[PDB]
Design a protein around this ligand. Structure first.
Ligand code: EP8
Ligand code: EP8
Ligand code: EP8
Ligand code: EP8
Ligand code: EP8
Ligand code: EP8
Lengths: 154, 154, 155, 157, 155, 157
């Protein structure tokens, strides 16, 4: 009965996120992606985009969440969070959060290293570049990319 | 059938290591501590010290290993490594190793953040301080500490 | 006479801050804790000052004042020319190194740092407040007097 | 005819920036300083002011010119038939941030980025910190070129 | 005429190095790859030079030489005063920033850095050799010519 | 009577070190520079040489003295009735490494450590790099005090 929560805003989910989802799903019996809730896509849109890109992962589900992440995790009978890390700044910031979360609620955090190909990817740089007409199609799931193009045109 | 290998030299195992062992054992169905093999304690001594301190963790075992870590992991039917991280330097160094290991063999690596109380602990600083008569008893399992005192006197 | 100013917003003061206060007061003849008045937080400056005074009652050579504007002015106006504070992380170091070099360049005021106590390395006032707001227990990260008053503000 | 674009807000240009301008101009046939403007947020200095301050302190660099722009930097670069960006780095944060931007820029447009290490004397200098210090009366005259210091004091008054 | 020296041990040259060679040669009128002779490695300096020449056959403005002693001397003796190399990580940056500032201080020679290609950020010669020694497949990290010769040395 | 120990190998002392000595002496009633010797590995300079070079460049610091030692630094500190260490930091690596040592030293002995930021001009200076550069003929005269430079050249000859 192993399991972990993979939290984020996912606005939108990137290939970097998706790689981490697949990797977590390969090592834990269940994975819950927690979409935390002022951006480009609505929560429902974000959830939909993630569900579409994770159809091939049977043991993964997607939910929205509010308030303390550790409460979200414990209310579901789990006590692990899983996330990817790209940079030293990611590590420093997430280590702080991980130690606070373990202190207040006993919830642990597991990190994985980014895929090298996606180390420079963020949802906010991808949206920014796309806005000015840069090609970010190699950084996003094919579905998400189309949804993005739609948002910028409308 | 989840599982991970927790590798290191463990010369000697510290409370920092032990905390990570317990945390990995809580989230994976099996954990193998892999003692990799020019220090203070022999491999057998290191294994013994770890086994003594992990008697309360039923799903953990301890083995020696040589050669490529990813071969050790795959020869045992696993494809995950688990380790703790204390510092930014830990993160940078281990990220490199993790990406190389995933590239050559598909073996993934999961990291956890050090317990705050042990963030400054290394086996080499503990041995060094103890050599000159500093009290490191709060940083090492009670068993290990006694074994250390014995090594310095003999 | 040796001395240093220990600056911050302290909204609220944490056990991390308090540890640094004690360690500074152990080494300098006088320490002045300077509570910065900004544009904004949870506690008023007077509330912050009282919480620090309660927590530092056993440090006779430490006093608490509010300040604003250029810190190196605050320091020099009190006949001192040293700042003291703690560092938790690499980002603390990078950020504070820049500020320290700027402060020494513009005014000749030096800055001394101490490493955080390991137990409080992950603590910040903002994160403590955030956690407490959603019901998390941060009582082991704050002095007793502060935790009570924090519960009061969240109600 | 080698060339690079040196981008920034330059609000205002500092001695750290100018040091990099000089070093870039010594190694590329032409250098274009690109004053990148956010049309949605004004800085302290207008685009004309920023350009003027840079020109006045780079008069002895014959192969350097100054132009403003907005939008994607890689478009500014390619529209001039170049494909190199050059800038300085002071800290580990600069390196992390600029490596991400450089990798993104090469990915989307094939434009490369060259970095130089800050002169040690100016490693702590930023436009924002200089402006902030000066706002409260601190002396930043040794961190900024003559073309800047008094105009900056003028804005603050 | 613009130009730069690209220094290293290249024992062996990797696809990471090669990417930087190509990017330097695209921007400078000439590039000199300088293979450092040390106290020690797997390949002789002549072997290293030949492997680089094979991999850089399509870069007409890049040449390969060996060198020893003070790098800024090597650079200036060839009428240049720029060094160029890649950076993978924060430790690369910290280390190379120190060396660059020292090299500019002592000789006026400047240093230009490029960011690693993301695909090769984790690559080092030492780690590639270590992995290959115990049978790991590093063929996607090295140029074709190098991988063959590496297999030869491990037998 | 406040006081701190400023430890190091000082093989040789640099201008970066001396800057820290001065700043420490300005803020503590007494400063003891501790020349820590590894009895199992000699450096370039003997203990007497290292001490001599430090004394010659600190003659105008009346509250500073120089002593050698070995073994645990916290014992050196406590045997003098002090419980503070003071030193400089230049880089993020220095901070990571020294924070570990400081936390270990306070844990085992209650001795505290105070750090100051390097002077920007000397941030890239180390004794090892200076020695290495000088070995191959590089000019490090601006990085080292007069008391050091020619003795260093003498050792290399
Ligand atoms: O920050 C972003 O916008 C963003 C977009 N893509 N990636 C990414 C890029 C490369 C690799 C893994 C993600 C990002 O980095 C976020 C890293 C922190 C993180 C928080 N929650 C997560 C859930 C799964 C994976 C990572 C995280
Ligand atoms: O490096 C050491 O000697 C040493 C001694 N104790 N700790 C430690 C201190 C605090 C927390 C977890 C360990 C150390 O840091 C090692 C960190 C990398 C690591 C490699 N293998 C591991 C297996 C389990 C846990 C960590 C590792
Ligand atoms: O940033 C915060 O909100 C916050 C809350 N607690 N601590 C802390 C946590 C652990 C140890 C020492 C403080 C924090 O870190 C601030 C670190 C920078 C600093 C600025 N002024 C200071 C005055 C005294 C001490 C530190 C500082
Ligand atoms: O960020 C600032 O406001 C600011 C003011 N001065 N300097 C500086 C300080 C010391 C050395 C080189 C600059 C700064 O750092 C910016 C570093 C990144 C950078 C982006 N574009 C650039 C163009 C030329 C040079 C640097 C950059
Ligand atoms: O350190 C190594 O063994 C090694 C093997 N491959 N790469 C590499 C990996 C990815 C990208 C560029 C190189 C390495 O990183 C070295 C980075 C520093 C560097 C010094 N001299 C250089 C010359 C050209 C390029 C880089 C350097
Ligand atoms: O590491 C070196 O060899 C070396 C030579 N000069 N500097 C230096 C360069 C710039 C500024 C302050 C020193 C060095 O950096 C050491 C930094 C850590 C340190 C340990 N003990 C010290 C005592 C006084 C000052 C610093 C230290």
């Amino acid at each position: 009965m192993t399991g972990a929560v993979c939290p984020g805003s996912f606005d939108p989910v990137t290939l970097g996120h998706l790689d981490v989802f697949e990797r977590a799903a390969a090592q834990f019996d269940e994975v819950i992606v927690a979409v935390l809730i002022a951006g480009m896509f609505t929560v429902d849109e974000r959830i939909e985009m993630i569900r579409e890109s994770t159809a091939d992962l049977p043991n993964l589900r997607v939910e929205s969440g509010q308030g303390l992440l550790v409460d979200f995790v414990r209310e579901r009978g789990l006590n692990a969070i899983v996330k990817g890390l790209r940079t030293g700044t990611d590590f420093e910031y997430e280590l702080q959060m991980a130690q606070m979360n373990k202190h207040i609620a006993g919830v642990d955090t597991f990190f994985v290293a980014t895929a090298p190909a996606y180390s420079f990817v963020s949802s906010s740089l991808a949206k920014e570049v796309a806005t000015y007409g840069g090609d970010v199609s190699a950084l996003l799931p094919a579905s998400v990319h189309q949804r993005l193009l739609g948002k910028l045109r409308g």
